[PDB]
Design a protein around this ligand. Structure first.
Ligand SMILES: [Mg+2]
Ligand SMILES: [Mg+2]
Ligand SMILES: [Mg+2]
Ligand SMILES: [Mg+2]
Ligand SMILES: [Mg+2]
Ligand SMILES: [Mg+2]
Ligand SMILES: [Mg+2]
Ligand SMILES: [Mg+2]
Ligand SMILES: [Mg+2]
Ligand SMILES: [Mg+2]
Ligand SMILES: [Mg+2]
Ligand SMILES: [Mg+2]
Ligand SMILES: [Mg+2]
Ligand SMILES: [Mg+2]
Ligand SMILES: [Mg+2]
Ligand SMILES: [Mg+2]
Ligand SMILES: [Mg+2]
Ligand SMILES: [Mg+2]
Ligand SMILES: [Mg+2]
Ligand SMILES: [Mg+2]
Ligand SMILES: [Mg+2]
Ligand SMILES: [Mg+2]
Ligand SMILES: [Mg+2]
Ligand SMILES: [Mg+2]
Ligand SMILES: [Mg+2]
Ligand SMILES: [Mg+2]
Ligand SMILES: [Mg+2]
Ligand SMILES: [Mg+2]
Ligand SMILES: [Mg+2]
Ligand SMILES: [Mg+2]
Ligand SMILES: [Mg+2]
Ligand SMILES: [Mg+2]
Ligand SMILES: [Mg+2]
Ligand SMILES: [Mg+2]
Ligand SMILES: [Mg+2]
Ligand SMILES: [Mg+2]
Ligand SMILES: [Mg+2]
Ligand SMILES: [Mg+2]
Ligand SMILES: [Mg+2]
Ligand SMILES: [Mg+2]
Ligand SMILES: [Mg+2]
Ligand SMILES: [Mg+2]
Ligand SMILES: [Mg+2]
Ligand SMILES: [Mg+2]
Ligand SMILES: [Mg+2]
Ligand SMILES: [Mg+2]
Ligand SMILES: [Mg+2]
Ligand SMILES: [Mg+2]
Ligand SMILES: [Mg+2]
Ligand SMILES: [Mg+2]
Ligand SMILES: [Mg+2]
Ligand SMILES: [Mg+2]
Ligand SMILES: [Mg+2]
Ligand SMILES: [Mg+2]
Ligand SMILES: [Mg+2]
Ligand SMILES: [Mg+2]
Ligand SMILES: [Mg+2]
Ligand SMILES: [Mg+2]
Ligand SMILES: [Mg+2]
Ligand SMILES: [Mg+2]
Ligand SMILES: [Mg+2]
Ligand SMILES: [Mg+2]
Ligand SMILES: [Mg+2]
Ligand SMILES: [Mg+2]
Lengths: 134, 265
RNA sequence: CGACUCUUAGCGGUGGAUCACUCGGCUCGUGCGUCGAUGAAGAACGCAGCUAGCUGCGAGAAUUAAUGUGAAUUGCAGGACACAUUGAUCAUCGACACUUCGAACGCACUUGCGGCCCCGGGUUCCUCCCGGGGCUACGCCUGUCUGAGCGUCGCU
RNA sequence: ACUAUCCAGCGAAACCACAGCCAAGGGAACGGGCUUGGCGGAAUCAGCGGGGAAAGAAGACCCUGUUGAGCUUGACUCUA
RNA sequence: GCCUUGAAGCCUAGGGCGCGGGCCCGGGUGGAGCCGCCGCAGGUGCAGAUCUUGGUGGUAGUAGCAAAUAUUCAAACGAGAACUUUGAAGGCCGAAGUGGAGAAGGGUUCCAUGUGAACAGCAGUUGAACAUGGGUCAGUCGGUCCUGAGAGAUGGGCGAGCGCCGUUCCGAAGGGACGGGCGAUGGCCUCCGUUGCCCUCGGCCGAUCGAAAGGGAGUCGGGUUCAGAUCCCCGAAUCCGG
RNA sequence: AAGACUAAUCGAACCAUCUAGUAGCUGGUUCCCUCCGAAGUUUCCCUCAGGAUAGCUGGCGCUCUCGCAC
RNA sequence: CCGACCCGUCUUGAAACACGGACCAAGGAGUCUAACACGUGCGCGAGUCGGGGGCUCGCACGAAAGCCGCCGUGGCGCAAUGAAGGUGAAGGCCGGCGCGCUCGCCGGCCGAGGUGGGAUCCCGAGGCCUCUCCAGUCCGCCGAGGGCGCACCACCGGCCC
RNA sequence: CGCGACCUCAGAUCAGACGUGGCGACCCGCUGAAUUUAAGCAUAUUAGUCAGCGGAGGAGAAGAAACUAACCAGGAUUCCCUCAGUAACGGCGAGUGAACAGGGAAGAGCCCAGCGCCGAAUCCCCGCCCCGCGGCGGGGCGCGGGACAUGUGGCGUACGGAAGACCCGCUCCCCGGCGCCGCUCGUGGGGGGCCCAAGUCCUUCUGAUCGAGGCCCAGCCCGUGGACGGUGUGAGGCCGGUAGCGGCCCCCGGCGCGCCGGGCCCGGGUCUUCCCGGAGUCGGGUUGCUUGGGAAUGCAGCCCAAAGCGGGUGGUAAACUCCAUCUAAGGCUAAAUACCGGCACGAGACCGAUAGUCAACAAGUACCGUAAGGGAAAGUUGAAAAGAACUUUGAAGAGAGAGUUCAAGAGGGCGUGAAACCGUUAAGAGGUAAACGGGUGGGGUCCGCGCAGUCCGCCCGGAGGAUUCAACCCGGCGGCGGGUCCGGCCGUGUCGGCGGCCCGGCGGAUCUUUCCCGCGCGGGGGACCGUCCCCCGACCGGCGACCGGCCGCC
């Protein structure tokens, strides 16, 4: 249950903030989980997604274990574009198909300076969380 | 609002014209020129009897009554039949005025909570709640009233040391403090049974709150319980006693009906 | 057997009721309680590669710098961005900049007329012409400067 | 002579309880509808103006209202 | 408790109930929520009100498309011609015009190319419609200047007060200038203006506004564009100021 | 000089507000079954298209009693 | 086949030659507060009410709930009357000191007075059925008659201003 | 004949500051109505109200008695309850209408002038040096200018007191600058930023699951977290978030200890003088508006116009006297209170696209008007555009095919898709306009026959087959009932024991005040009375308050 009186718990206000958020927030909302292996090694559960991450699809028509990469992150509509998932149009031209990132599993990352930094803060937060709860 | 229908500057076209004598709008090159205004009928007008804010929303009720009822709800919290009828799966608890050690005021973890109720056989009412979790029927979904469910049992304690944060999360359970009881939680909906759970320290000090018959409260400054109007309700046991049966006439079970007149002549 | 008229049902039309949804209102309450001559409130005109409106902004004009974050914006284009020179886009907001009217302030509302000091062509001040910059409102307070009086006296 | 009339093409309105053959009788005392008799046969075209107590304008004539306003004076109370 | 193995709502020559209010089943459509019991509460049940808002009929393929004399023949573009265009013939306006130019007002309607949905109360290959592009050139033509009937600030007066009266009326009302003297001034301090005065003459008599027909110096001819000319090019002049 | 004109308006323009002005007077007032069931008359009113007063009507009761040998 | 004039409304009286009404869907008209009178329901009871405020919850509920030397400051009630000053609701019976004078002084007893009507209650001769005589204790009911008499009504009388 | 002055007075693009206008819900001051009610109307009421003109703040205003009262007296102002629908006003008619006292929220008091003392002991501006500079200050030196005696600063204001004698007293408070340290109740002052638990597990529908079912217990896992929202249906465990006296970083606060500068040398008990204090003002006439204020509550104009043991008040005019109570005509002040505009936030027994703001959408927009001004209509493809390629007729518009989608019986104003009104098809009928009620007939559309509907159940009789038990005994288990009340509990109701009454407290308009505590008293003691509770005995009501017995029955 909730106890704090300075935030909302109201249907209309959640939706309004969601459908009118700026981009530096849509990044977090457009987060996606990891696989079991990566969780174990890094001791983390979720990262925001990027443009050369390797991913699977879990739910829908295009689920299966075929693995692909990310191509384009159309935040304005809360979707992403994978390389092989695509359909033919009337003319005989292939085009991509958007899918929400909650429905995908990341298998390989795209690391760099900032993204290593980000993982470490998540690790230490959970670490003291376990050691102090326990 | 106070102004709903009185933004305009309308005036009636009089008689002599083949329209029906209500106020109408002044001029223009719009749709809304000679339409209709100022009335419960006319589109864009005002409600009948604007709902005012100095309605009488609240109520006062005499103190002695509220104390009486609090006493009544506790009574029927015993008497298994009433609990059954209020829909509480209860047929495995070992005693109905259910009482436990005063240790459980110091629990802090929901696992200690849940494990306990399993042993005292109060988990079947809880499963019943989970089953009931469903959705509401009406416009209350738009108005932050979207889900609903049953009420579960109620725990009454005296001194807090973390019991609340254990039972806080389990649904349908509400916590009460014996010093500050409430009718809206012991008789939800207006009816009278509810499956309540006590502790020792709470259960003992009820004599000191609401008095016995012989003495009085000592925490309320003047309150002696309500007196019975009719001691023995065992009606069948009465009417079957010898004393009354000696003082009766005979019954008359024979039954007489519409006789058909035949003609003697 | 025909047309035509009437009734009922099936299907197709016209028209937009009911039903289900909702980034809007109304009502109550909590906290704070801040405009401007250092030029307000409001008005006008303008600014996008493709752009009319709404929205945002002011000739540095759909936004600059500086911090926080950390790989996009997107209807089409074209290019940039190397994220271990560092730093796309977003949000914030402490530096900088902020057209014409308007209390509106050189005189007047046509955008018409001027006056003073300074720089640069006008030559080498010497005056006419051109550009450019800074001043040029009413009332009022303290003090300075120059002044008026058959006002009250003193003095030679 | 221009129309009205017919054909091609485009194309409105006011009005409309339901509707639309007559005599007499009674009735809120002058009925398309009731009663007793006369009678009764698809769908329509140009006209004319007897009826529909035909359409328009909540009767300006008359009365009432303890509803008004313009004008006058020797009405009443006040005033520049 | 019911439910994507199908909720609400809607339709129904179907089966049935209740004196009635009303309801339960069956079939079709449709696509996500809904109901029964005990209590609570109310913006709670329509045939009308010359009711309000929206929509649709008979009327009705009707009344009508009649003020100002008038059209015809052929050819061309084109899917396509009573109405466009070219030619020819017959006719009207009849110089106080159905002609050629302008003020007030309108504001891109102007000019070319393309289109034929909508509009042009019939039609249209056309259009003042739709779309895309282009177009207004001044020392001398007008404004700007002056004042007119008149409007209107200052000083003053009055007024609860935003303010009003009034325009020479109860005002130390012009910074106006000038010839001379005084020291200074930068330029070769010659010649100057100058910031400064001492002198020196000073009336005006009321700020300001007010006319694209009143008053107010001076430009004419020829040629040139899809569309502009006293403005552009050619050629001949002229006013003002220094 | 006609009671004529003052933006299609004049025997006192138009715009907003006071303003949901007042109305003893006209027109309208939303489901069912059961039960009881009227007046248009008295006196007073600057009363005569209207109110007060009594009468006519309904509902809620209560004190008694009887074929209960009275 | 018989019956059968179009709904609403005003009216002594409407099928009307009395007004309204072409047709369909949606909206649409006896309310909220403040005060009073009575009737009903609940609680306490010569008393009864915390509504203003304060002590405990940060308020998820819940702007709730509980509590108070406030516990009664106070309001309505328990006492009326008069313009006001002001006064302010019970008797008797018996015996002692003055003459029962429609009258003043010492001691006991009862006590909200009485008349009439009055739901119920009380006492009760003689018994109603006892397979017979007498004795005959528990129990109904009778029923002669006779008493204690609730509320309420009519009257008499008394007390206060 | 130049200088000092003011009676005084103008000027300057002089050096340096300032004011104007806008919003206007709450606030302060003026001005100020008519509808309406009175069943008519003129006083009254509506109303000191709408409209109108000014002026402000985060609150404003008021405010520390020229009071209330008549008491055994209280003691600034402001809000609440109550006094009270009262006293009083009133064509005494409709109608109006307060204060004190009492109980609460909050609570804080103080400066001048004039008398009187102190060598004007006082202020502003320019110049120079040093600290500090973005709410321009501090310290020092100028025979540097100026204001002021037509009165600047210290002491001191009626609390009644205040100044000048006599004895005690023990002698730090502030600001100007420069460092420090502990995060400071909702249980962490403020703001900003980044982070923190657990299933996408097996079987199965579907167009896709967040569905149904199962995982030692709603089952696996978490749980101080099961609020909300999003994702191709409904999600505690997919994502963001949520709870947490959870963590990391940045700035702004304030609360206090250090170090120099400068100020201030600044108290209280017994005698002689001071003040008695604020003028066109009180007050009195006459007039007008207002008030509950009535032989005039308050306010304003004009006339008259004061006193100093005086003046004012003391709710009926005037005189004569006794009392009580305040000290006007100068000034300032926080808190308790108000808030339909503004900036941010949360919530709802509210409306759900003819409703609710006029405004859910490019709305104060389009548009009407010469101007003031008036002022709308208008929500929904689908999960995703995958938004109908190619063939073919036609000048094109429109069509037949094909294709996408679970679905186009979802095709760019495309959720569903009523009624009136139309087109067509099937059936039926037709000279007293149509429609209507009761009663029957005929025909069609559908439901159920069954392609017999012979309906079903108990006991007895008969012929056929078949496999357990029961009948009766024994063993264990469970339950009902009982009373010779078998033994024991427990519970009541008074009693017996006062037995807890001090081995336990609560109260008392009973005494001891036999005591004390600080001195007529406030409290604990000591008795006393009642009221809650201890040990054994009893019986009713042993009752529906429980055992171990024995007995019978099932
Ligand atoms: Mg409305
Ligand atoms: Mg519903
Ligand atoms: Mg719709
Ligand atoms: Mg004709
Ligand atoms: Mg006839
Ligand atoms: Mg006749
Ligand atoms: Mg007729
Ligand atoms: Mg005729
Ligand atoms: Mg009439
Ligand atoms: Mg009339
Ligand atoms: Mg009359
Ligand atoms: Mg008039
Ligand atoms: Mg006269
Ligand atoms: Mg859906
Ligand atoms: Mg409602
Ligand atoms: Mg209604
Ligand atoms: Mg209707
Ligand atoms: Mg009706
Ligand atoms: Mg014709
Ligand atoms: Mg013609
Ligand atoms: Mg021409
Ligand atoms: Mg011409
Ligand atoms: Mg012209
Ligand atoms: Mg046409
Ligand atoms: Mg043209
Ligand atoms: Mg001029
Ligand atoms: Mg001219
Ligand atoms: Mg005349
Ligand atoms: Mg009305
Ligand atoms: Mg009438
Ligand atoms: Mg009348
Ligand atoms: Mg009648
Ligand atoms: Mg009549
Ligand atoms: Mg009728
Ligand atoms: Mg007739
Ligand atoms: Mg009528
Ligand atoms: Mg009609
Ligand atoms: Mg309706
Ligand atoms: Mg009552
Ligand atoms: Mg101002
Ligand atoms: Mg009147
Ligand atoms: Mg009247
Ligand atoms: Mg009148
Ligand atoms: Mg008044
Ligand atoms: Mg006002
Ligand atoms: Mg103040
Ligand atoms: Mg009272
Ligand atoms: Mg008044
Ligand atoms: Mg008081
Ligand atoms: Mg207090
Ligand atoms: Mg969901
Ligand atoms: Mg969820
Ligand atoms: Mg998570
Ligand atoms: Mg006076
Ligand atoms: Mg008055
Ligand atoms: Mg004072
Ligand atoms: Mg003040
Ligand atoms: Mg709508
Ligand atoms: Mg709708
Ligand atoms: Mg709307
Ligand atoms: Mg479908
Ligand atoms: Mg669909
Ligand atoms: Mg549709
Ligand atoms: Mg049909």
């Amino acid at each position: 249950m909730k106890f704090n009186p300075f935030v909302t718990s109201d249907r209309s206000k959640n939706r309004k903030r969601h459908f009118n958020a700026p981009s530096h927030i849509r990044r977090k909302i457009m987060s996606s989980p990891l696989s079991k292996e990566l969780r174990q090694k890094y001791n983390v559960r979720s990262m925001p997604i990027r443009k050369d991450d390797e991913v699977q699809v879990v739910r829908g028509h295009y689920k299966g274990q075929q693995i692909g990469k990310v191509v384009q992150v159309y935040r304005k509509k809360y979707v992403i574009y994978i390389e092989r998932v695509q359909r033919e149009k009337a003319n005989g031209t292939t085009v991509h198909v958007g899918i929400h990132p909650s429905k995908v599993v990341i298998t390989r990352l795209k690391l760099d300076k900032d993204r290593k930094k980000i993982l470490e803060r998540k690790a230490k937060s959970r670490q003291v969380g376990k050691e102090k709860g326990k | 609002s106070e102004l709903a229908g009185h933004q305009t500057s309308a005036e009636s076209w009089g008689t002599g014209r083949a329209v029906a004598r209500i106020p109408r709008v002044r001029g223009g090159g719009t749709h809304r020129s000679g339409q209709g205004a100022f009335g419960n009928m006319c589109r864009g007008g005002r409600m009948f009897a604007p709902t005012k804010t100095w309605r009488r929303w609240h109520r006062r009720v005499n103190t002695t009554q509220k104390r009486y009822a609090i006493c009544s709800a506790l009574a029927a919290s015993a008497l298994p039949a009433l609990v059954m009828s209020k829909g509480h799966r209860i047929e495995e608890v070992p005693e109905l005025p259910l009482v436990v050690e005063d240790k459980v005021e110091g629990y802090k973890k929901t696992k200690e909570a849940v494990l306990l109720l399993k042993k005292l056989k109060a988990w079947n009412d809880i499963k019943k709640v989970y089953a009931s979790q469903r959705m509401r029927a009406g416009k209350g979904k738009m108005r932050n009233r979207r889900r609903i469910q049953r009420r579960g049992p109620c725990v009454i304690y005296n001194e807090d040391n973390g019991i609340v944060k254990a039972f806080r999360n389990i649904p349908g359970i509400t916590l009460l403090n014996v010093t500050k009881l409430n009718i809206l939680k012991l008789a939800p909906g207006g009816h009278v049974g509810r499956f309540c759970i006590w502790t020792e320290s709470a259960f003992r000090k009820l004599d000191d709150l609401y008095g016995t018959w012989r003495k009085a409260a000592s925490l309320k400054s003047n309150y002696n319980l309500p007196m019975h109007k009719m001691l023995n309700t065992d009606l069948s046991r009465i009417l079957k006693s010898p004393e009354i049966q000696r003082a009766l006439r005979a019954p008359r079970k024979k039954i007489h009906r519409r006789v058909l007149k035949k003609n003697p002549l």
